Write a protein that binds this DNA or RNA. Structure first.
Ligand SMILES: [Mg+2]
Ligand SMILES: [Mg+2]
Ligand SMILES: [Mg+2]
Ligand SMILES: [Mg+2]
Ligand SMILES: [Mg+2]
Ligand SMILES: [Mg+2]
Ligand SMILES: [Mg+2]
Ligand SMILES: [Mg+2]
Ligand SMILES: [Mg+2]
Ligand SMILES: [Mg+2]
Ligand SMILES: [Mg+2]
Ligand SMILES: [Mg+2]
Ligand SMILES: [Mg+2]
Ligand SMILES: [Mg+2]
Ligand SMILES: [Mg+2]
Ligand SMILES: [Mg+2]
Lengths: 110, 97, 99, 139, 243
RNA sequence: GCUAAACCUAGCCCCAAACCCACUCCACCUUACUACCAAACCUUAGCCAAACCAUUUACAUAAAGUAUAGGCGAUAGAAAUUGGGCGCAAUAGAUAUAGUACCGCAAGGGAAAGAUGAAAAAUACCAAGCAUAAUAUAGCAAGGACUAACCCCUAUACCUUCUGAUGAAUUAACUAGAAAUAACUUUGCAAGGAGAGCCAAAGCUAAGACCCCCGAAACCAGACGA
RNA sequence: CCGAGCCUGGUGAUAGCUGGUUGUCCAAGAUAGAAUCUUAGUUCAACUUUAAAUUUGCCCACAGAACCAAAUCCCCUU
RNA sequence: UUAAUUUAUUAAUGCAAACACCUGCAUUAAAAAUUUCGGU
């Protein structure tokens, strides 16, 4: 599968996006998908257990955790129940804050 | 009694000999070789059970349906015997019901 | 030292010995050498006469179509007959309910 | 379940995801949009088994969709027909018979199957009136 | 451990093994093919694919070949392709009852025929169905000429067919002595099932009888090595004559 | 100290491949191991599971454990089409030392064990019981103690149905939890997942974890016994 | 060993019946009903215990709880 | 066993089929075969 052909306006007709160039100078670093999207996913378990995670985190991930708590701070008030996967290089937040999290990563641009 | 009497035979074993040297060499055969042949053929072992690893009852079932017409009569009666045994064994008496 | 080189493919498609009593019937029949042709082209294969179906098989396929495929006009006529019968049944039921 | 096994199953193709593949470049619009195109880039997959029907368009939300295409699905909404035609699409609906659709959908293997090319049979009588009417923008 | 070739062809394995493997290739073909006959009770279904009755689904269906329970005595005559059936049945033909094992035996009749090809009368048991088969063939000689031996499904009729074939491929005057005109008329009439003279060798015999024909054929008094060495010395003398 | 122990290695284990066995002379279907006169095929049955009992029931990958059938009560069951060692080491593993002794009128059932060293033309201590040494008032044999072994004081033999009585002389060796569907947890990928199928409205693949041992009398086939 | 010979296979037959089922260390954890050719067993039933998600419970004080004794229940505060 | 039910099997009939023999279908028996002889 190759990289997408250029749709002239951003976001796309269905709203897809290219990652912005050059990447930002934030120590939190996000890679995209093999099929090229922003790497955010839900998580369903244990009947009522809804959570979410960003998968391919890299760098000093604790900064991304603090940022996610800060964005989440106005979102629900409670402190973020989050855990990184340092060997796996991931971050996960308890609860599904999914589309807004994708928006936060998109506004980060990188 | 139940122990040895002397120190047993000295375990001369070279851990770095040739017949173990390549142990798994050229055995990432599939994706590292442009998909010509899977590892699912690289195993040198019996054709009764070369890579469909079910239960014990499944193991015998595969042994029958693969090679039953190639056995001496003792093996055929034996495989039939244990196959009947296992078919009774799966769904009759256990811990979870 | 250095092991023997890893497994390669087979040397093209190989026909089997028809004299061999061990061969399963799945790879020595009519469509099997067809599969061999589909593997190694005509480059290793045989004359392409196996590709076209047999004339007896052609008549069999024609029979299969005649017992397995109608014409659109026949289906349309059946649909028209069914619709006319349904309308007549509906009119008769309405007349019986009205009376 | 009496006729669950005789029930037809048709893969619903999300046309918003068709717009995605248009944007993501899985299926380019420079050539016809066929089931060959619908499968070839892995945007939405078909299952020949389970006594299935085939590919049919979906019905939600054609806002912000700017492309030209020629869709050939088994079934679609009248809203989907108008969705295609709004930018000026092409909509056609033939059948795809079971062995025929199975040969069609994964064209890689039957291209190396060795038998000669089969031809698609006409739809059955129940499916016949569906294709017989142009109100479905069919074939 | 395991035996290499499969026992499902073990008997067939011996068919290619030794002295019996020196049997005629025509005998190999006649013992090799397995064409099936028309049944005695398994009425044939219509075609390959048909609509399901309770499902309305086009499904391909075949027919079961019911095994012919052949008693030994029926081989001693020319019976039909019919016989008995050793099976079971329900009391009211109802599967919700206790069924019992059952039998369906034939009703034979001792009749007689007078074959011109045999030019003799043979009286044996036959079936009224076999009578109808001969009548549809219009003559016992034509029936012997007509059906396959595998279609015959009887030893005595197979032997009669073997004799008829030997007589036809022999064309000896002893078939119709002092009447060669009738012999020629019958030979023209029986020109249909003409076979080679070699084909009369293993004609219809048992596989054991095939081994018998082999031992009667492959055996001979061994050549004398006095005679063999004499011939070798004669060859040496002929060669040294050129020396 | 004796009995004893211990020791490797006989050969068995499964697979890979491969088609094998049958004539020193002789004799050998009568009372088999003695040189000699007038006849074959005929449907396996049955329990079990229905918590009793009866119809029913087994003796490559993929569709698919779906279509067929069920005292519609238990389950059983497709075609189309597609393509050398993570084995042992004399109680273990072939019982194997041999289908022998013995047992039984026969068919049959079917055991046991040895250990040297390069050389046999080289002839170091321990399971239990005992003596080496027998005993000292009293009591589940022990504990706290002690000048001091015991006498001093406390002290209802163990494992288990029980609600509070059966087994075990004593050693030494054998001997008894393996079915992953669901869910979870941990990994890889992500609107796709996975080396044809299956599934997906956050899922899909890999692994992990649940399933004993002993013990009836029964019954049917096939023999063998007056 | 004749109350239906013996033996081999089928046969790891079968009964819900007894008994026995192997080393350690932390956290929690004991008695209510109803069916059942059933009380020697099993199934609806409750308790738990754990995993996740969602903020008040136990002890009570006023009022109140029926016509043909102890009391008990709902029940602010502590 | 006159509990129940058949009737695989015979033996009779009768009816079919063939021109005394064989096969099929009903009924009847003899003999069998399948299943029942509850609790406090
Ligand atoms: Mg999840
Ligand atoms: Mg039962
Ligand atoms: Mg098949
Ligand atoms: Mg041993
Ligand atoms: Mg042993
Ligand atoms: Mg001692
Ligand atoms: Mg005392
Ligand atoms: Mg214990
Ligand atoms: Mg005792
Ligand atoms: Mg017993
Ligand atoms: Mg046994
Ligand atoms: Mg048991
Ligand atoms: Mg019990
Ligand atoms: Mg009841
Ligand atoms: Mg009752
Ligand atoms: Mg009970």
């Amino acid at each position: 599968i190759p990289d997408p052909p250029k749709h002239e306006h951003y976001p796309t007709p269905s709203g897809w996006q290219p990652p912005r160039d050059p990447p930002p100078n934030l120590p939190y670093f996000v890679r995209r998908s093999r099929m090229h999207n922003i790497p955010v996913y839900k998580d369903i378990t244990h009947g009522n257990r809804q959570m979410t995670v960003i998968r391919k985190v890299e760098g000093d991930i604790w900064a991304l955790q603090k940022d996610v708590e800060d964005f989440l701070s106005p979102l629900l008030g409670k402190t973020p129940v989050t855990q990184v996967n340092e060997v796996t290089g991931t971050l996960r937040i308890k609860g599904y804050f999914d589309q807004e999290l994708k928006a936060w990563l998109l506004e980060k641009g990188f | 009694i139940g122990i040895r009497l002397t120190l047993p035979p000295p375990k001369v074993v070279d851990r770095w000999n040739e017949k173990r040297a390549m142990f798994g060499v050229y055995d990432n055969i599939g994706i590292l070789g442009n998909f010509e042949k899977h590892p699912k053929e690289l195993i040198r072992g019996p054709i009764w059970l070369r890579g469909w690893k079910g239960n014990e009852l499944q193991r015998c079932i595969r042994k029958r349906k693969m090679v039953g017409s190639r056995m001496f009569a003792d093996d055929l009666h034996n495989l039939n015997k244990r196959i009947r045994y296992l078919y009774k064994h799966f769904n009759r008496h256990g811990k979870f019901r | 030292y250095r092991a023997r080189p890893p497994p390669r493919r087979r040397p093209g498609p190989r026909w089997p010995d028809p004299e061999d009593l061990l061969t399963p019937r799945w790879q020595l029949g009519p469509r099997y050498a067809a599969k061999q042709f589909a593997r190694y082209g005509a480059a290793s294969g045989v004359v392409p006469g196996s590709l076209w179906p047999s004339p007896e098989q052609l008549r069999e396929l024609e029979a299969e179509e005649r017992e397995w495929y109608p014409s659109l006009a026949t289906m349309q006529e059946s649909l028209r007959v069914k619709q006319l019968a349904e309308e007549q049944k509906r009119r008769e039921r309405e007349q019986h309910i009205a009376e | 379940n009496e006729g669950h096994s005789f029930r037809r199953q048709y893969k619903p193709l999300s046309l918003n995801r068709l717009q995605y593949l248009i944007d993501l470049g899985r299926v380019d619009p420079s050539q016809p949009i066929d089931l060959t195109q619908l499968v070839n880039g892995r945007g939405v997959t078909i299952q020949p088994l389970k006594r299935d029907y085939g590919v049919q368009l979906v019905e939600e939300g054609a806002d912000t969709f700017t492309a030209k295409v020629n869709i050939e699905v088994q079934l679609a909404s009248e809203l989907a027909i108008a969705a295609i035609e709004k930018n000026g699409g092409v909509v056609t609906t033939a059948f795809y018979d079971p062995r025929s659709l199975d040969i069609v959908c994964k064209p890689v293997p039957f291209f190396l199957r060795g038998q000669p090319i089969p031809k698609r049979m006409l739809p059955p009588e129940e499916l016949v009136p569906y294709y017989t009417d142009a109100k479905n923008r069919g074939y | 451990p395991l035996h290499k070739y499969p026992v499902w062809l073990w008997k067939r394995l011996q068919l290619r093994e030794g002295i019996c493997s020196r049997l005629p290739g025509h005998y190999l073909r006649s013992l090799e093919e397995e064409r099936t006959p028309t049944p005695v009770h398994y009425r044939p279904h219509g075609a390959k694919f048909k609509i399901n009755p309770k499902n309305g689904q086009r499904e391909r269906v075949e027919d079961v070949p019911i095994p012919i329970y052949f008693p030994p005595e029926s081989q001693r005559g020319l019976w039909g392709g019919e016989g008995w059936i050793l099976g079971q049945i329900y009391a009211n033909n109802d599967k919700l009852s206790k069924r019992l094992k059952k039998v369906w035996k034939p009703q034979l009749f001792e009749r007689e025929f007078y074959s011109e090809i045999l030019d003799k009368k043979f009286t044996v048991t036959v079936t009224m169905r076999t009578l109808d088969l001969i009548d549809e063939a219009y003559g016992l000689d034509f029936y012997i000429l007509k059906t396959p031996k595998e279609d015959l499904c009887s030893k005595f009729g197979m032997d009669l067919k073997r004799g008829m074939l030997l007589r036809l491929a022999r064309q000896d005057p002893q078939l119709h002595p002092e009447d060669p005109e009738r012999r020629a008329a019958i030979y023209d009439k029986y020109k249909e099932f003409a076979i080679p003279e070699e084909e009369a060798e293993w004609v219809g015999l048992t596989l054991e009888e095939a081994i018998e024909k082999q031992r009667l054929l492959e055996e001979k008094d061994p050549v004398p090595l006095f005679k063999i060495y004499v011939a070798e010395l004669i060859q040496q003398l002929q060669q040294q004559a050129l020396s």
